Amino acid sequence: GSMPPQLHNGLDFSAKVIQGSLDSLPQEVRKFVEGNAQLCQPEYIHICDGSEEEYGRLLAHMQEEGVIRKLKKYDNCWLALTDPRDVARIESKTVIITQEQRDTVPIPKSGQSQLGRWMSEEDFEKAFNARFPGCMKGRTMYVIPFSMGPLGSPLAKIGIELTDSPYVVASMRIMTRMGTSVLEALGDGEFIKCLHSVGCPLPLKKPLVNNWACNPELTLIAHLPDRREIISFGSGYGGNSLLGKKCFALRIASRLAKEEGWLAEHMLILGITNPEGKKKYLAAAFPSACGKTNLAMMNPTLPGWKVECVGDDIAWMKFDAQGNLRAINPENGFFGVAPGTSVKTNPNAIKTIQKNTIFTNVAETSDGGVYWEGIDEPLAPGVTITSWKNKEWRPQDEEPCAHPNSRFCTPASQCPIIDPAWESPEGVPIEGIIFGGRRPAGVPLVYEALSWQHGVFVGAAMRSEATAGAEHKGKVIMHDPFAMRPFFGYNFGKYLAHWLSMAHRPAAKLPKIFHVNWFRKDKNGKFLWPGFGENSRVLEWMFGRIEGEDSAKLTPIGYVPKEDALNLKGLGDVNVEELFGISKEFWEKEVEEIDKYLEDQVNADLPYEIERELRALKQRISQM
Ligand SMILES: Nc1nc2c(ncn2[C@@H]2O[C@H](COP(=O)(O)OP(=O)(O)OP(=O)(O)O)[C@@H](O)[C@H]2O)c(=O)[nH]1
Ligand SMILES: O=C([O-])C(=O)[O-]
Ligand SMILES: [Mn+2]
Ligand SMILES: [Mn+2]
Ligand code: NA
To answer: Which residues bind substrate?
Structure first.
């Protein structure tokens, strides 16, 4: 980029650049970098190249600074422990900026929307001015050029993230394609502008907790889709700071998708091969902390079945000229929930995470390894544990050894069952789409939608127990339509209309739509379904249905498996009565709840087809 004019020496940041060159940046990239440097006043500017040496040195630097620790039991793995105020997404501080509120969320009848948070442009400007001026004083501003999707993909989009956090830098290296090749690929093209600061300019005004720079009181994660900007202040935690992931690849991207005729979704993408040598790709939207990563890299218990992972969290999809729904994973790594992860529940993850992996808020064993709730693996006598709170911890204490939302951040290329087409620019053809969440009562193991319009309603109607992915506590059953409640880039009613419109386009090969429940419990609080690898039995049913197998019976909520259609061999004890039961009383209550929620929260933007599906379901239940 060209040197900016100036009458003094305060606008050209060249003298502060410690890696790279402002002169060699594309013009608009330099303007973005330099304009935000003038604002944030970093001491240095480091333009990331994405090299292993850059990565190695930056890790070493955080190490000597006490910001991360080396996990010496493994190969190039590292541990960060955060300030306990900065441990997850915060939905209440996550906002979208548009001229009119209705462009961002439907106007709720009750007056409080549960489908996003809108902030006026003028309110945002004030919030921005109270945060960012001088916020990087005494820090390095890192410039991360990154690509969502393989360098080529028709589906791929480039961002530049500016951050004062080396932790963000290292994590983005794993979770996106990052560095010099991205700038070369961008040229003078368009990019998403992403600005991040931990909100702790030097000298420190507040006491630093556990060497983790953050500003909880001022935390704000903002999205400005008209400006193509994401602006995030005060949090270093993944979902808030790795701007390509939730901020770009769901929130911004879903709005772009609506405008441009594609889809951006909170979905895994997996490839499943049967004993007859046939492979199908499926997508699944479950809410945060509801099993996507476990399903995407499942080790099937059924002989002759194979599952391969394309992506575990984000799907970008578009109908091609042939009418196939084609999906790509825009991420480059897995940012997975650690606790619960074991050789038993997710052996494929256990394999992936022992090299080149960054862990956040898990426990450390005295021999340099990791520990967490449900790791289900004994330690040798004499091995001791440091909790994620950096305290000595014993298996019989008050609190967990790892944070409930503790994460691993691991390269996708490492996964032993990574799908061979996971970086194909063409994407993979999706043949079914699975919705589901945590319902301890009433909702059977699996059912199939009656039609496209009904499947879109099933997505819209999704409810699920609260999890630790964000700020929500306890186990209350919440609405989480399409697993996208925290992530809609625009009015949910319009998003429903967008999904419905897919049925109207030329030669569209619409996928089969299913709904699952891994989480139904008996009257004792015991899970009725073993889950995990055993979920291959459900996927088998879905596979045959996609092929047109006569294996379904009609019920009021959709098609279910016929008696004996599911392979339950090796699971002789399963209470099929309760697991597959559909109660009129439960479903009457359920449909009334859905009706009130859609009326209140979607209101004037609720598409007629969805209100029709509600009426029809209500009618079918009334005839039980
Ligand atoms: N009982 C049971 N638990 C499961 C199952 N699948 C996943 N889990 C657990 O649910 C928690 C979260 O699962 P993940 O697969 O990481 O969820 P995710 O959808 O990828 O979550 P986000 O990354 O937050 O979007 C972990 O503790 C898992 O061990 C299952 O089939 N049965
Ligand atoms: O990080 C995630 O994947 C989430 O919170 O859903
Ligand atoms: Mn997620
Ligand atoms: Mn996940
Ligand atoms: Na720390």
So the answer is: 89, 237-239, 288, 405-407
